[PDB]
Amino acid sequence: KRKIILDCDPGHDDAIAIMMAAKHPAIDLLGITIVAGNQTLDKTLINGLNVCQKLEINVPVYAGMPQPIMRQQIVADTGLDGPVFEPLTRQAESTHAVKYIIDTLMASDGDITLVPVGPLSNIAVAMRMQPAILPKIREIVLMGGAYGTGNFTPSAEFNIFADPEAARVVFTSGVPLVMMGLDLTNQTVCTPDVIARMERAGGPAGELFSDIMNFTGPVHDATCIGYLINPDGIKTQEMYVEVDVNSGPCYGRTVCDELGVLGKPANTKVGITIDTDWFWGLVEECVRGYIK
Amino acid sequence: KRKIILDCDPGHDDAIAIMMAAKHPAIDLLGITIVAGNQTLDKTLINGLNVCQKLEINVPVYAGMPQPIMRQQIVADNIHGDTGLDGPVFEPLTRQAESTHAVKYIIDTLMASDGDITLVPVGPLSNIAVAMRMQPAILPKIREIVLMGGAYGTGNFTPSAEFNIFADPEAARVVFTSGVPLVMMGLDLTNQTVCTPDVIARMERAGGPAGELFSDIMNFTLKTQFEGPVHDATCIGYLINPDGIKTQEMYVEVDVNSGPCYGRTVCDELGVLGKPANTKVGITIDTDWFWGLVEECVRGYIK
Amino acid sequence: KRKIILDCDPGHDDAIAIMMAAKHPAIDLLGITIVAGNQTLDKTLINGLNVCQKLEINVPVYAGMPQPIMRQQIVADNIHGDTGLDGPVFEPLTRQAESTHAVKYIIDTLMASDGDITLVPVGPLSNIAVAMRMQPAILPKIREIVLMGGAYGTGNFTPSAEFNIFADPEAARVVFTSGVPLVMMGLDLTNQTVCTPDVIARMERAGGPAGELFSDIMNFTLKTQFEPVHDATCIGYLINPDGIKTQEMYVEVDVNSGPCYGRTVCDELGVLGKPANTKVGITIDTDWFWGLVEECVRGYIKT
Amino acid sequence: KRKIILDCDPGHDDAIAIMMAAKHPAIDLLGITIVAGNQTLDKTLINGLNVCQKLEINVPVYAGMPQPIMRQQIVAGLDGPVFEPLTRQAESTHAVKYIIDTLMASDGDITLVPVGPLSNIAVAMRMQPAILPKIREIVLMGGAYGTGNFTPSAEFNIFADPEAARVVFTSGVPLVMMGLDLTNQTVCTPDVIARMERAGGPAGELFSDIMNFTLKTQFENYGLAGGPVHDATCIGYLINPDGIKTQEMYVEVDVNSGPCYGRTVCDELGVLGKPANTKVGITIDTDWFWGLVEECVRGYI
Numbered sequence A: 001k002r003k004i005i006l007d008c009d010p011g012h013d014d015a016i017a018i019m020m021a022a023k024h025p026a027i028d029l030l031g032i033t034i035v036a037g038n039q040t041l042d043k044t045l046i047n048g049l050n051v052c053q054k055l056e057i058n059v060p061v062y063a064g065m066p067q068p069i070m071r072q073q074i075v076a077d078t079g080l081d082g083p084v085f086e087p088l089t090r091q092a093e094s095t096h097a098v099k100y101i102i103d104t105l106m107a108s109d110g111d112i113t114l115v116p117v118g119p120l121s122n123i124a125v126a127m128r129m130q131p132a133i134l135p136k137i138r139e140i141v142l143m144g145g146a147y148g149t150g151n152f153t154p155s156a157e158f159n160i161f162a163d164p165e166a167a168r169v170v171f172t173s174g175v176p177l178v179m180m181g182l183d184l185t186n187q188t189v190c191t192p193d194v195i196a197r198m199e200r201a202g203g204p205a206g207e208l209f210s211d212i213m214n215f216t217g218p219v220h221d222a223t224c225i226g227y228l229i230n231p232d233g234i235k236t237q238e239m240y241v242e243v244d245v246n247s248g249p250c251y252g253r254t255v256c257d258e259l260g261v262l263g264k265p266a267n268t269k270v271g272i273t274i275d276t277d278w279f280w281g282l283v284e285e286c287v288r289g290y291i292k
Numbered sequence B: 001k002r003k004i005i006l007d008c009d010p011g012h013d014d015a016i017a018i019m020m021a022a023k024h025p026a027i028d029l030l031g032i033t034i035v036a037g038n039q040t041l042d043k044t045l046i047n048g049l050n051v052c053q054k055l056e057i058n059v060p061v062y063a064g065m066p067q068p069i070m071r072q073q074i075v076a077d078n079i080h081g082d083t084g085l086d087g088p089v090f091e092p093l094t095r096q097a098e099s100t101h102a103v104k105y106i107i108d109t110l111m112a113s114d115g116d117i118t119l120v121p122v123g124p125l126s127n128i129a130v131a132m133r134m135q136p137a138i139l140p141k142i143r144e145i146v147l148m149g150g151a152y153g154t155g156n157f158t159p160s161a162e163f164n165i166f167a168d169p170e171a172a173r174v175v176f177t178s179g180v181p182l183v184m185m186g187l188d189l190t191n192q193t194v195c196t197p198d199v200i201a202r203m204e205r206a207g208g209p210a211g212e213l214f215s216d217i218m219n220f221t222l223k224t225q226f227e228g229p230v231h232d233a234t235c236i237g238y239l240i241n242p243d244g245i246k247t248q249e250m251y252v253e254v255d256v257n258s259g260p261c262y263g264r265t266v267c268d269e270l271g272v273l274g275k276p277a278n279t280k281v282g283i284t285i286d287t288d289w290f291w292g293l294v295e296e297c298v299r300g301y302i303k
Numbered sequence C: 001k002r003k004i005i006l007d008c009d010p011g012h013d014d015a016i017a018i019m020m021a022a023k024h025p026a027i028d029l030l031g032i033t034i035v036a037g038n039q040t041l042d043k044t045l046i047n048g049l050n051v052c053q054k055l056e057i058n059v060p061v062y063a064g065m066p067q068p069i070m071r072q073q074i075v076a077d078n079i080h081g082d083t084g085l086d087g088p089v090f091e092p093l094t095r096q097a098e099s100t101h102a103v104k105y106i107i108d109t110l111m112a113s114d115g116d117i118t119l120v121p122v123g124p125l126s127n128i129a130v131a132m133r134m135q136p137a138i139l140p141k142i143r144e145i146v147l148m149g150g151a152y153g154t155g156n157f158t159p160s161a162e163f164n165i166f167a168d169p170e171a172a173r174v175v176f177t178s179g180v181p182l183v184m185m186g187l188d189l190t191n192q193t194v195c196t197p198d199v200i201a202r203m204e205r206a207g208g209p210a211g212e213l214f215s216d217i218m219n220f221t222l223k224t225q226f227e228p229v230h231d232a233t234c235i236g237y238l239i240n241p242d243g244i245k246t247q248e249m250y251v252e253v254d255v256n257s258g259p260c261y262g263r264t265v266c267d268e269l270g271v272l273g274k275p276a277n278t279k280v281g282i283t284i285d286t287d288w289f290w291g292l293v294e295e296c297v298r299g300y301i302k303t
Numbered sequence D: 001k002r003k004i005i006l007d008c009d010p011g012h013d014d015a016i017a018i019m020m021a022a023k024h025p026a027i028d029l030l031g032i033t034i035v036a037g038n039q040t041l042d043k044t045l046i047n048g049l050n051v052c053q054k055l056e057i058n059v060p061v062y063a064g065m066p067q068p069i070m071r072q073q074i075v076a077g078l079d080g081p082v083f084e085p086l087t088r089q090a091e092s093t094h095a096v097k098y099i100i101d102t103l104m105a106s107d108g109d110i111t112l113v114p115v116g117p118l119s120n121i122a123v124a125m126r127m128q129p130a131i132l133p134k135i136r137e138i139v140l141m142g143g144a145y146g147t148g149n150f151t152p153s154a155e156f157n158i159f160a161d162p163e164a165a166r167v168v169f170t171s172g173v174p175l176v177m178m179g180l181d182l183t184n185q186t187v188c189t190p191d192v193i194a195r196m197e198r199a200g201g202p203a204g205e206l207f208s209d210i211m212n213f214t215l216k217t218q219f220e221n222y223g224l225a226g227g228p229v230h231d232a233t234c235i236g237y238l239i240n241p242d243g244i245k246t247q248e249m250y251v252e253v254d255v256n257s258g259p260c261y262g263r264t265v266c267d268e269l270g271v272l273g274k275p276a277n278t279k280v281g282i283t284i285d286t287d288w289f290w291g292l293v294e295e296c297v298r299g300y301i
């Protein structure tokens, strides 16, 4: 079992990642930490809690950074339309996500993996507030970046663009990094038949996936959970990656040295291709785990 | 009494600021928070605790950020030396930091207050920026921020930048875009508060723990000048009597561009940008007034 | 016939572009202008003149900018060698550059024209930018600019930047903000045109002066490819644009110092909502392209 | 006599610098080159030509760069004087070519005096790098080690073409910088105008017509009973450098887009440990300077 903390900004695809992480026997989901991103933190928190309540996921949820570390906040109704939820009974823990991340890593034996699928604000604050966490982190498997074309701008993918300075901290940490960028995640196109596949499986997870993906196309965040379940399903390439924090046309770009021209040691395993038959099989496996 | 939290990286002149803040009846020093800057946090924390122990200052001390929010860490081992507070000899340290992180202390204290607390940052702005972004509801709770840092003219660590800002430019950008009333004691002002041999003699002659401390500290730093300004303490002077310091309201922007002006406080002295002022920038200080205050504070420790 | 001025820094692939441009009946090559790039201008000029002499191309050659407009000069001595055109041995050089500076030639030729001339820059954009800013009245006279440079994906000289743009980013900014119709043969397209062992064998079979030159030239870059023909794609494009698929995009040149200096930022998906300014090369029919190269090379065989 | 080429964008104070340069026996004014700056090149050229015609200055005038080398053009155009119908014209040679050819043919004794944006100078330097050792010195009006004018960070001439200024400041040619810190001290008051006006002649009337306008639109805008003369300080410097205190500094031009675009970053305290590249103007003896202005005016009588 890979122990993980899932840091997210739900978010339609975050919800799918939560669904997969909380159920699969290859994953030990220790906690869910929430960051502002797709929407403001008040909304992403409610969204995360709504998902956990509907799926009866009893993992603690921690609210983190409501704002990026430096830049003016950007966002991408509720932030998770489609599924209708019960009146919210479950709540966030009283501990700040940044403190939770620090304390959990400090008390561990270095076997915990961070899985950020939102802006990297919680992660960067934790890293700079307690640098002793760095050798405690086994790996960081993040959804974010693009070696090719971004989405929010031609240069930048949303998660990085939303907090470039936080991304710079993470990408200069020296912790082993895995980057599921848009180049990879844009390949995981969910089609009506994928939705129809999951509906027939049914249960709480099946309906939620259907409700979410009907409203929404790529699933992005869930690829990080796929990767931790079976890395063989995803081809990566080791690259030296630098985050551009210059104001201007490449603000929040992940500059990926695909050809090794800079002669710098690689710092990231960059997602290249995904076996989508493998991936959807896994999504269904996770969906079927919620039937009582 | 102005309630303050003094955020600092001792630091020779930080220690002078602590001495002043903890004693003057116009100041209610609620807590001392420590940041990395002059030296690494392990050292600035020991330095701050050493000063409080020697002066018998019973105010809680909180350790904060050991690193800036984004950039690769720099120190000032240029002026402050090995420990970062050379000159005085301290007894073995028995006093310790609180278990609460400085960032949490700042948030909790501001959130629980009625908005009458002033932050006094005299190191890099790392603690302040983290507190602000972690809990933006603190913003209207902050009465004012009186910071030592910046320069409208020439910097120190680079031509463009003063050390506190240069040590965490992204943190400084957060503070200078917060919308909270700012007062900036930049180098243009603080370079005027040069401590001469006779200012040192004046404090030695007054004596007691604080006179000895001032003397050991400043006699060391003046030795490095032969081979000096007090900077941080002007923020405390300003809160005691703002009439002693002439300020000018300016729109100030922090440059976070990598390059020759990284960490520059760009101060619109002539108002050419047509933007509302966000900072009262220090222009001139009455040094007779200032040294009188320093002596007043030194005598408070006479036991 | 498309009238062109070919602006180049020979350069192995520049030589192939000269060979194609000077011979094909769809092209009226008015003049060759030389810029520093692959090597310093003294060398690229000698290289250009060497090519023209060997192929008996009687078109005037003009020396232009020896330096980029702002940055510290870089060369590509890694691929192109000591001379900038290592490989072919040339007879003693008897032919020479015209006395007119390339920048003046470009301005004068455009100003005197009826607006039917196309510029074909296949080196850094230094000559073009200087001409544009020295005489802005040339802008409406330029029919189109078909340039080799840039990359919407990965660069070559850095991960972000292609050599020609990287060698003079500020010049490239001028060209990409000129409002003149632009065609960009970037690396994404040109990397599809690799010259393998079978390509060299084919050309030298066709033989004669251009055959032997292709082979001597392209064997050196294969000997440094123990570890593409780029420039000639611009001439291919002008002969038959149907052989090359382009996509209209808003392209911006990044002149920020840092990891994307000299990047052509290409808005592939139109997310910025700005009007396209460039037809960006996407794919090339390589059967069509090599057919054209042979058509051109055959044109040189002797009686 | 110091041989100079005066590169300018007239411009009220450029006109004063022309007046001084063309008359003083310590200066050999070889040619005037014009650049876009204060106004577009069509207008600055006409302004330059008007000044020369009115003062009967017969030095050849060359039109140069109408645009900066990279950035989108900005402007800041010579009110006060009334000029007769213009008959003088620019030479047919582009100023950039003139500068290159004149330097290449020389023995290295010519000084360049740029008092507009540095566009002509940068293009000439990159077009023909062999001119660099031919340039004895560059005495420029531009920059500020403290506060700029057009932005808090930047002085107009540099701001108008930062990339050109980066070229000049990295050229290795000895530089003298009359920045705003110096020139803002050169305050022309009513008594200074009186002195020139009462000396009389064409240059005294021109000074007076120009500066009266400058003073009227210094009083109406901020009054402020005087206004700086900037460009002419470069000519004062070449006549007698003793009148102006300079300090050697390593200066770097910031070309980053943002709040310090076009800033001259001047290492006043030497903290970067880099060799000085610029003699930066610190203070001027204004009694000396106004005496010299009057002397120049009198040369036209």
Ligand SMILES: Nc1ccc([C@@H]2N[C@H](CO)[C@@H](O)[C@H]2O)cc1N
Pocket (backbone or CB within 6 Å): A011, A012, A013, A014, A038, A076, A117, A118, A143, A151, A157, A158, A159, A220, A221
């Ligand atoms: N447009 C858009 C905006 C925001 C997102 C969110 N950001 C990452 C991919 O960029 C994913 O984690 C999405 O949840 C995704 C998309 N597609």
Ligand SMILES: Nc1ccc([C@@H]2N[C@H](CO)[C@@H](O)[C@H]2O)cc1N
Pocket (backbone or CB within 6 Å): B011, B012, B013, B014, B038, B076, B078, B079, B122, B123, B148, B156, B162, B163, B164, B231, B232
């Ligand atoms: N050189 C030097 C570097 C850093 C400092 C510290 N930073 C501010 C002034 O820049 C003050 O807060 C000093 O504590 C002081 C000095 N003297």
Ligand SMILES: Nc1ccc([C@@H]2N[C@H](CO)[C@@H](O)[C@H]2O)cc1N
Pocket (backbone or CB within 6 Å): C011, C012, C013, C014, C038, C076, C079, C122, C123, C148, C156, C162, C163, C164, C230, C231
């Ligand atoms: N490495 C390298 C460096 C420079 C060049 C030259 N620059 C453009 C391609 O980027 C072409 O115009 C080549 O002449 C080519 C290569 N292959």
Ligand SMILES: Nc1ccc([C@@H]2N[C@H](CO)[C@@H](O)[C@H]2O)cc1N
Pocket (backbone or CB within 6 Å): D011, D012, D013, D014, D038, D076, D115, D116, D141, D149, D155, D156, D157, D230, D231
């Ligand atoms: N405001 C103003 C703007 C521009 C100028 C022009 N630029 C330099 C001073 O910055 C001088 O060369 C003036 O001609 C002068 C003034 N006075």
Ligand SMILES: [Ca+2]
Pocket (backbone or CB within 6 Å): A008, A009, A010, A011, A013, A014, A037, A038, A117, A118, A221
């Ligand atoms: Ca997400």
Ligand SMILES: [Ca+2]
Pocket (backbone or CB within 6 Å): B008, B009, B010, B011, B013, B014, B038, B122, B123, B232
């Ligand atoms: Ca301090």
Ligand SMILES: [Ca+2]
Pocket (backbone or CB within 6 Å): C008, C009, C010, C011, C013, C014, C037, C038, C122, C123, C231
């Ligand atoms: Ca080339």
Ligand SMILES: [Ca+2]
Pocket (backbone or CB within 6 Å): D008, D009, D010, D011, D013, D014, D037, D038, D115, D116, D231
């Ligand atoms: Ca001028």
